[PDB]
Structures are given as structure tokens and as C-alpha cells.
Design a protein around this nucleic acid. Sequence first.
RNA 1: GUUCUUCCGAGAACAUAUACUAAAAUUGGAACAAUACAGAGAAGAUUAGCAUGGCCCCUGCGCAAGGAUGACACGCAAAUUCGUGAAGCG
Length: 58
Amino acid sequence: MTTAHRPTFHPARGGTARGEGDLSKLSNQYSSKDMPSHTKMKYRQTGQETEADLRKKD
RNA sequence: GUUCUUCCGAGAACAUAUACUAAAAUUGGAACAAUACAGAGAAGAUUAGCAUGGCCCCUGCGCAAGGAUGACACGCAAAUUCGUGAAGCG
Ligand SMILES: [Mg+2]
Ligand SMILES: [Mg+2]
Ligand SMILES: [Mg+2]
Ligand SMILES: [Mg+2]
């Protein structure tokens, strides 16, 4: 019988790869996109119809 | 060891703790080249390719991509339990 060509009847699980569960388990090889980028965080301006002021604004 | 003190051969200050310390002696752990054999995924054959899984790697700068689809998988799969009437006995 053929059985190697099977789908995922069994559930997928994870949470144990490189650097998961312990921060020292990151290898010093890191991916090209793991470079620091977009490091200045944007925020929404003051008076953006913020929730409490919006609530007031019935 | 130096700049100074003098009663004279001593005194004050400056200077302040190197080194996985070995020229060694010991003790684990990987792949190498090839005589003969029989030889590489899918209900006949030629057989794609891409997936899926874990206490399996290798090449790669790599969330790219290759390594036979990289290899494997390839059936006792029972795993919460019964219910019935004939005929021997005794
Ligand atoms: Mg093929
Ligand atoms: Mg591949
Ligand atoms: Mg190939
Ligand atoms: Mg594969």
C-alpha cells in the first residue's frame, strides 16, 4: 500500500525552533531581512478622533 | 632603583600583585579507496514535479534554491464492549 504520500491528518504543532524558549538558542547566522529596519516608530497624531474625545464628540 | 635628608648608615617620598600559569604528558571524535555482488518514489511500462512528519543531515550569505520528491513513510492500525438459541453432558 502507498502511505508516504499522505496529507496532514495529524495536527501541526510548533514553538521549539531556533531561539524559541531560550534567547541564547539563536544561531549567529541570521537572515537578510532580520537587519534593523523602520526603527523610528510612527504614531497617530494628536486629535485623531481619539476614543475618549470621540465619545465626548457624541 | 631614583629625588632628597643628615649624624652617618640609616630614614621619608616615588614604585605595588603578571599568567587558561607547559618547551609539555595525557584523553574522546569526524571522513578516507574499492576487489565482486545487485542496484535506487506512485494499483503494466517511461515516470514527472510539489507538498506533508522528527531525537535525520549536507551544500548555500540566505525567510532564495539545490542534494533521488535529499533519505525515510509503505498496515497485527481494535483504542473505553457484547448478545444469542440447538446438542452433549451432570
Ligand atoms: Mg522525480
Ligand atoms: Mg527540494
Ligand atoms: Mg532533485
Ligand atoms: Mg523532501
